[PDB]
């Protein structure tokens, strides 16, 4: 009856490997370095914890943000960190420099996240009041900022591909305009909910998407709800697809509905376990990302830790 019901993708099950409990507070951003040698693990204690990617050992700390930094990324062509938050301090932490020289500027209010382009010499920062600053690399200024948000921008993204926009304000108003034009050629006045899960699915185009209620698929060209997923009522706080087309969306309420690649509905329907220090109903999946080798999933819950959900050997996963 349901889509992909008589075609169960015989993928392996997840398996927790270890939890690196070294942060002090709810983890804000978690990302693995491109070289498979660093693991940028942010925390609300005003200290970016850049640990090891696969080992998870304490590599080094990095302060500079006065408050919780809800934005952290690492560039490819620009070997330097990229932080962003309410502190308005971008930690340009190079692997050899180990300092803060970015000096993110342009947002006249708080910041909830940012994203640097992989190829184009541009970026994006989710300002608080109404701004969407396209922080140009080696410019520290939003010369061409696609400002189409009336509240705190949920997320931001831009690259050499041609969806041309990824963003959305907190006042139920998004700007799916052309990044080259700058003007609001296409106002994405939809998704009034807290849309904070837009992970790349299979192909660059006609991929999957998410939402905090009834998550479904999307499309890079013009958008389309093709892969009709199940009723993902869980508030998907983020999503980082696997290396082999699979998709996983971390939930803000702890119930991370794990959907298959093309199935859409929750295949595992996993949840966030109650940590020993955490309360009964207080936790929530803040980040979830597969490693560079896609061997262990780095899932950072609200217990100030990062779990390594490795894969197990089993084909007994056939369900109608």
């Amino acid at each position: 009856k349901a889509p992909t019901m008589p075609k169960p993708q015989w993928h392996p099950p997840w398996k927790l490997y270890r939890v690196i409990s070294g942060h002090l507070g709810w983890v804000r951003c978690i990302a693995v370095e491109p070289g498979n040698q660093w693991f940028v693990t942010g925390s609300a204690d005003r200290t970016i914890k850049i640990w090891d990617l696969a080992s998870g050992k304490l590599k080094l700390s990095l302060t500079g943000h006065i408050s919780t930094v809800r934005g952290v990324i690492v560039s490819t062509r620009s070997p330097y960190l990229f932080s962003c938050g309410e502190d308005k301090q971008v930690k340009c932490w190079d692997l050899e420099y180990n300092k803060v020289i970015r000096h993110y500027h342009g947002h006249l209010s708080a910041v909830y996240g940012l994203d640097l382009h992989p190829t184009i010499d541009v970026l994006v920062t989710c300002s608080r009041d109404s701004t969407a600053r396209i922080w140009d690399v080696r410019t520290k200024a939003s010369v061409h900022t696609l400002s189409g948000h009336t509240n705190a921008v949920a997320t931001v993204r831009c690259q050499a591909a041609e969806p041309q926009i990824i963003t959305g304000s907190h006042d139920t108003t998004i700007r799916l305009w052309d990044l080259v034009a700058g003007k609001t050629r296409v106002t994405l006045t939809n998704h009034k909910k807290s849309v904070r899960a837009v992970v790349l699915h299979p192909r660059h185009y006609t991929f999957a998407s998410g939402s905090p209620d009834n998550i479904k698929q999307w499309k890079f060209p013009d958008g389309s709800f093709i892969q009709n997923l199940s009723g993902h009522n869980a508030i998907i706080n983020t999503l980082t697809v696997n290396s082999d087309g699979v998709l996983v969306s971390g939930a803000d309420n702890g119930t991370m509905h794990l959907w298959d690649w093309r199935t859409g509905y929750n295949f595992q329907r996993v949840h966030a376990a109650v940590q020993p220090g955490s309360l009964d109903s207080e936790s929530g999946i803040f980040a979830c990302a597969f490693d560079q080798s896609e061997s262990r999933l780095l899932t950072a819950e609200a217990d100030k830790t990062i779990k390594v959900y490795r894969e197990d050997d089993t084909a007994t996963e056939e369900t109608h």
């Binding site: 190829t119 184009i120 010499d121 140009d136 410019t139 010369v143 050499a160 591909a161 041609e162």
Partner: peptide, 23 residues
């Protein structure tokens, strides 16, 4: 991804023009 390169070149030219105008 030739169109990607074209879009990137257009973005670079626009950024350079904006820098020359402001700076």
């Amino acid at each position: 991804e030739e169109a990607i390169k074209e879009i990137t070149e257009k973005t670079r030219v626009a950024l350079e023009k904006s820098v020359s105008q402001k700076v």
